[PDB]
XYZ file of C-alpha atoms in Angstrom:
113
model
C 0.000 0.000 0.000
C 0.903 3.562 -0.744
C -1.689 6.050 0.479
C -3.702 7.233 -2.519
C -5.736 10.446 -2.159
C -9.101 8.758 -1.793
C -11.287 11.569 -0.411
C -11.094 13.891 -3.411
C -14.313 15.685 -4.360
C -15.048 18.374 -6.953
C -14.789 22.007 -5.906
C -15.758 25.178 -7.718
C -14.924 28.879 -7.283
C -17.728 31.042 -6.102
C -19.588 33.494 -8.346
C -19.076 37.164 -7.492
C -15.537 36.205 -6.496
C -12.930 38.503 -4.908
C -9.177 37.901 -4.996
C -7.737 38.230 -1.515
C -4.191 39.560 -1.711
C -2.831 36.314 -0.249
C 0.406 34.504 -1.046
C 1.454 30.877 -1.253
C 4.282 29.690 0.987
C 5.878 26.252 0.833
C 9.233 24.587 1.441
C 9.347 24.028 -2.332
C 9.691 27.757 -2.954
C 9.896 27.029 -6.685
C 6.414 25.504 -6.465
C 5.113 28.405 -4.360
C 6.451 31.137 -6.651
C 5.024 29.314 -9.673
C 1.648 29.287 -7.911
C 2.044 32.892 -6.735
C 2.755 33.784 -10.374
C -0.840 32.799 -11.212
C -2.455 34.826 -8.397
C -1.025 38.342 -8.575
C 0.419 38.500 -5.065
C 1.986 41.868 -4.229
C 4.037 42.529 -1.114
C 3.075 42.470 1.591
C 0.659 39.535 1.669
C -2.453 39.907 3.797
C -2.109 36.231 4.738
C 0.040 33.183 4.005
C -1.372 29.843 2.833
C 1.226 27.187 3.626
C 1.181 24.594 0.838
C 2.033 21.031 1.852
C 2.459 18.096 -0.512
C 0.194 15.082 -0.116
C 0.066 12.989 2.059
C 1.377 15.757 4.319
C -1.765 17.840 4.915
C -0.532 20.108 7.695
C -0.613 23.119 5.368
C -3.735 25.073 4.521
C -3.458 23.806 0.919
C -2.583 20.222 -0.061
C -0.795 19.490 -3.341
C -2.247 16.464 -5.154
C -0.430 14.639 -7.938
C -1.988 15.336 -11.335
C -2.236 11.577 -11.964
C -5.371 11.654 -9.776
C -7.063 14.334 -11.893
C -10.514 13.517 -13.271
C -12.778 15.637 -15.497
C -14.995 16.055 -12.411
C -12.209 18.246 -10.957
C -12.033 20.618 -13.942
C -13.203 23.618 -11.888
C -11.257 22.578 -8.780
C -11.156 19.981 -6.046
C -10.757 19.615 -2.293
C -9.334 16.685 -0.311
C -11.652 16.625 2.726
C -11.872 20.435 3.067
C -8.227 21.517 2.587
C -8.261 23.134 -0.882
C -5.928 21.439 -3.318
C -3.600 22.287 -6.183
C -2.194 19.972 -8.833
C 1.476 19.171 -9.356
C 3.640 16.902 -11.498
C 6.930 15.966 -9.806
C 6.336 18.676 -7.171
C 6.170 21.402 -9.829
C 3.752 23.120 -12.200
C 3.801 22.291 -15.904
C 1.572 22.913 -18.925
C -0.796 20.100 -17.906
C -1.467 21.430 -14.393
C -1.865 25.064 -15.497
C -5.532 25.081 -16.522
C -6.736 22.997 -13.525
C -4.595 25.080 -11.147
C -6.075 28.372 -12.379
C -9.432 27.033 -11.183
C -7.923 25.758 -7.917
C -6.558 29.245 -7.209
C -9.973 30.861 -7.690
C -11.388 28.283 -5.266
C -9.070 29.875 -2.682
C -10.527 33.348 -3.264
C -11.759 34.813 0.028
C -15.037 36.186 -1.306
C -16.316 34.074 1.588
C -15.553 36.444 4.449
C -15.011 38.980 1.625
């Protein structure tokens, strides 16, 4: 056994969405800056969303391997409530781009606006 991400469900950004000026932070700073490149984060960040790689879910965002992507996750996904982002070999490529743009808008704090 190697723990597969089993509790993946579709997620979707909310209509009337607002981009919170938040930043990604992660020990793989190359992965965080590639994700921050898709958000528009300007210094200083209002908050930091620590990104951890699955199965490590101690960060506010879990990074799932793109091998587990299904068309059901086209607008985003969440692994039991910690919003997710896709990665191939712990990095962003041209396959993860389009699904990750949706995953980033799922993080938009139009909730507490």
